[PDB]
Design a protein around this nucleic acid. Sequence first.
DNA 1: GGGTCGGTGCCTTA
Length: 512
Amino acid sequence: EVYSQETLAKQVLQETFGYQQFRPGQATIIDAVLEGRDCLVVMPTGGGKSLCYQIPALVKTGLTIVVSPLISLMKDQVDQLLANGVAAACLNSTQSREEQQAVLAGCRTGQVRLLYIAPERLMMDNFIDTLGYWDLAMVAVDEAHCISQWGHDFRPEYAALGQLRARFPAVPFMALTATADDTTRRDIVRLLGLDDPLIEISSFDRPNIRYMLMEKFKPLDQLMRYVQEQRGKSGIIYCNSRAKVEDTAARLQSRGISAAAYHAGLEHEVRASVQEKFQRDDLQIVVATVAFGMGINKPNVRFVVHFDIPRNIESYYQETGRAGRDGLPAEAMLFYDPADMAWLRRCLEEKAPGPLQDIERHKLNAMGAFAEAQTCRRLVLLNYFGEGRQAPCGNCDICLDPPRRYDGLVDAQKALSAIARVEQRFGMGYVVEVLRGANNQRIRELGHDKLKVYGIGRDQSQEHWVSVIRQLIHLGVVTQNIAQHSALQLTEAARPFLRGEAPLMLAVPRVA
DNA sequence: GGGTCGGTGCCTTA
Ligand SMILES: [Zn+2]
């Protein structure tokens, strides 16, 4: 029968949307849902995510409920559908009671064909009761990765949508998202109760995006230099904390660079104005927390900067994926400091042990492995998402500037010697002063001139040496014990490196 | 030389 349903779908594709043909995989997804099967759609490339549920919604007789994470997303999606003559509506707190009653009346009557709604509203026990007295044709959960990303802590009603799926077993369910690795895919199936879903995964390759990493040495200065080299094209700078995004914004506005902070601490209409100025290109740069995310419709973001490393590869992929949507060259730049990773691990140890923390820890660890990789950045991303590839890309920082290594036994002995010289007590900021024998008070107030480690490594610049110590921490030769003021202690692997018995190769740092 | 670093959003009708 399959041919009959697709022709009805093809007609909707042409009549209400004006498009000519289905693109590869669109037909197979729409076919599946039109014959009653559940579906999980992971579409990082393709741009036809919304059509995958909106077209079967218009072919099926009955109501389609679209679960949506953001009020602004609901409104934008409803607006586009009404512009196409489709009877779409949404429900949210910003409406009046009279407005909501009219939406619900249209739902009972069937005037409304697609209803956009947040999980917190839909999962109310009495609301689900009134659903039974409608003609429900399909449920589609947009940005379904929220089920897993938020359903366990931030917004628990995202994990309750399975209760809805169990209440209406004969109504097909769709989960659709742009970013999801294997763990997230199975979690969506599990928490949503999809019954043997068709799983369709498109490619994660964005050839026009250039993945770049720079080691954080003087962060603000490097961030200043990178932006001033962008010569006024649009971009986003992500940081962790609201305080940081507010500070950095003011520093760039101190130069005359068009830049504005964005975070959830700002009143909402401020958020709408910054998002709108940015999108109409009257604002060059947005400094932002993760709050600046879903629903940003801007085709010409030319750079996305991560001033702080994200928590997992999915977040990094989704965030860098906002760049170069027009297909023209764009750049992703990550300012990496291993200290930011250890800060992220603390935040994780701060939470309850168990399987959820085990996964968050592995996701974090994989992100740190992406940052530390001495191989094509694109090969790490693609394979992490299960898309097998071995050919390096030629458009990452590893491919364009291959790593170069030098014998570090000399420099690492000079460093490993000077860190034992303090008896495990100084931090990295202290220890690197003695290796370049700069003149200051505690190198005499404690008496740290009468060591031959003082003034031994002025030969090379400051970035070179703290890079060495970071490399030794990564190899397990030095620890950073933050339980005693970030002092560098020495481990048991340190021994053969001071003796010169073990060979050692170190990479030069990432610098522009 | 400076994060002393968390951060994401629905929904309120006793
Ligand atoms: Zn590459």
